[PDB]
Every structure is written in structure tokens, then in C-alpha cells.
Design a protein around this ligand. Structure first.
Ligand SMILES: Cn1cc(-c2cc3cnc(Nc4ccc(-c5cncn5C)cc4Cl)cc3n2C(=O)OC(C)(C)C)cn1
Length: 262
């Protein structure tokens, strides 16, 4: 197996992941350099779906110049039959990494959070609110976290089917438009809660039905066991404030002692 993108030949090592009509391959160029190639089959794609793909490429392209905590898109091929996205290759996603790494280093978690804040902050300044942030959306690329998904197009799953725990209370209690940047603050807070306490705030809830009521209810107080990083505990408490108005903002989080002090 081998593939061609803009007159450049890439040899397929393995399939990293798949989605709907898409597949992500770990490839090598002629110079033996590693890349992640997302192939999209547009044969049965509707206009709404083609538009999600079109928007992902455009936002991945605009955002390039604004942050290095956003996955690098080196090249792309778009016809009416397919898409090819030549991207940088990361070592592992944060979800698969958090399952393997039992204990998280305080300095690594800190550095990882700075990375997540800068990436989500960049999407916010360009009018994107993700609304479905999970660790799988973050990738470790040379000891750095980069954002790979924008909630624009369908999510890619790894190959060798999703979570409800990172969902904001305003997104669940929506149905009866309240999707603001504050929704991403909650989801990021759940990733940092996972990186601190080894579980998401509502991982305790066995059934998915009762889990949604727990994210909604204010009487269900979230647990914050004492830690030597009192800075981190305040970040965790602020991100997980149920009312979006009281919840901390991304520009506020960047000015927090946890991010700015030793
Ligand atoms: C917009 N978009 C970006 C991507 C995307 C780019 C991309 C670049 N590097 C990687 N490396 C990578 C990531 C994870 C694993 C892995 C999974 N379980 C255990 N392990 C070690 C192995 C590798 Cl080698 C992936 C990339 N993408 C991507 O989706 O990974 C998935 C399908 C994993 C979400 C796909 N769509």
C-alpha cells in the first residue's frame, strides 16, 4: 500500500484511525519523514457533510499562522471524489496516553494545560467554540499538546464509541442558543480533573441517564480532594462552576497563578 498527494508519494505504515468515510494513516514521504494522512471518501457525501470537511480544512489552514498548539496541515488535495490532508504525526492522543500513564507529573500536567489553553484560546479568537472537547481531541507531538479536532467535522476514532463526562451543564439542559466559549472551559476543566484525580468528575455515575442529571443538578456537589497544588484546586473549582456566567474565562485562566507562577 502507498498513496499520492500533490505529486508526492507516501508509503503507508499503518492505519491510526477511522471515522465515517475517512481513514487516518501513519505514512512516510520519500525522505523517510513521518506524517498523518487523513483520507476522506466523498462518493456518498451530502452538501451539509461536504461543508463540515470544507470548513475543517479552512480553519486548520487559517489557524496555522496563529498557534503552534494547533496540528500542522502541510498540504491538502480536494476533488469531488476525495480529500487528502497531510498533517504532522504525533506520538499518541491524550485519551490513550491517560489510560497508560497511571500517575501524572505535576510539571507535565501544568505544561499540558498551558498548551490546551493556548489552543482553545486560538479557536475562540477566530469565532470557533468546539463544544465537544475530550482528551482524544489533543495530541502529544514532541512533548507538546496540539489540538487536532474543532467539533466542525465528524470525530475520528483510533484503530488497533464516545464519552458523556466532558459535557457542559448548559449543553445538556439546553433542550426544552446557549453555546458560548464558557462551554469549552467546562470540558477543559474535566480533562484537568482527570489529569489531577485520575477520573472525570462524574465517572462515579455508572449509568449514562443518571450521569446527565448529575451534571445538571446543583445539589450534586463535585469532589475536590486536597492537593499540594492549591493553585490547581482553584482552577478545577472555577472551570467546574455550573453557571456559565460564574465559570472562569479563557483570558482569566491565562492570568491565573497556576499558569503564570513558578
Ligand atoms: C483534523 N484531523 C486530524 C487528525 C489526526 C492527525 C494526526 C496526527 N498524528 C496522530 N498520531 C497518533 C495518534 C494516536 C495514536 C494512538 C491511538 N491509540 C494509541 N496510540 C499510540 C498513534 C498515533 Cl501515530 C493522529 C492524528 N489524527 C487523528 O485523528 O488521530 C486519532 C484517529 C487517533 C484521533 C484527523 N483529523
Amino acid at each position: 500500500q502507498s498513496m499520492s498527494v500533490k505529486g508526492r508519494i507516501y508509503s503507508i505504515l499503518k492505519q491510526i484511525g477511522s471515522g465515517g468515510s475517512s481513514k487516518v494513516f501513519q505514512v512516510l514521504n520519500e525522505k523517510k519523514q513521518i506524517y498523518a494522512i487523513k483520507y476522506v471518501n466523498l462518493e456518498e457525501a451530502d452538501n451539509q457533510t461536504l461543508d463540515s470537511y470544507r470548513n475543517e480544512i479552512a480553519y486548520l489552514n487559517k489557524l496555522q499562522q496563529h498557534s503552534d498548539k494547533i496540528i500542522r496541515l502541510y498540504d491538502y488535495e480536494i476533488t469531488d471524489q476525495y480529500i487528502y490532508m497531510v498533517m504532522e504525526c504525533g506520538n499518541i492522543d491524550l485519551n490513550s496516553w491517560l489510560k497508560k500513564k497511571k500517575s501524572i507529573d505535576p510539571w507535565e500536567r501544568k505544561s499540558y494545560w498551558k498548551n490546551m489553553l493556548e489552543a482553545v484560546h486560538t479557536i475562540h479568537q477566530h469565532g470557533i467554540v468546539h463544544s465537544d472537547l475530550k482528551p482524544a481531541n489533543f495530541l502529544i507531538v514532541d512533548g507538546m499538546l496540539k489540538l487536532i479536532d474543532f467539533g466542525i467535522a465528524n470525530q475520528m476514532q483510533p484503530d488497533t464509541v464516545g464519552t458523556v463526562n466532558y459535557m457542559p451543564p448548559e449543553a445538556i439542559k439546553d433542550m426544552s442558543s446557549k453555546i458560548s466559549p464558557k462551554s469549552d472551559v467546562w470540558s477543559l476543566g474535566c480533562i484537568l480533573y482527570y489529569m489531577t484525580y485520575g477520573k472525570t468528575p462524574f465517572q462515579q455515575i455508572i449509568n449514562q441517564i443518571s450521569k446527565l442529571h448529575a451534571i445538571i443538578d446543583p445539589n450534586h456537589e463535585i469532589e475536590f480532594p486536597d492537593i499540594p497544588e492549591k493553585d490547581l484546586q482553584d482552577v478545577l473549582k472555577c472551570c467546574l462552576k455550573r453557571d456559565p456566567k460564574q465559570r472562569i474565562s479563557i483570558p482569566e485562566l491565562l492570568a491565573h497563578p497556576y499558569v503564570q507562577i513558578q
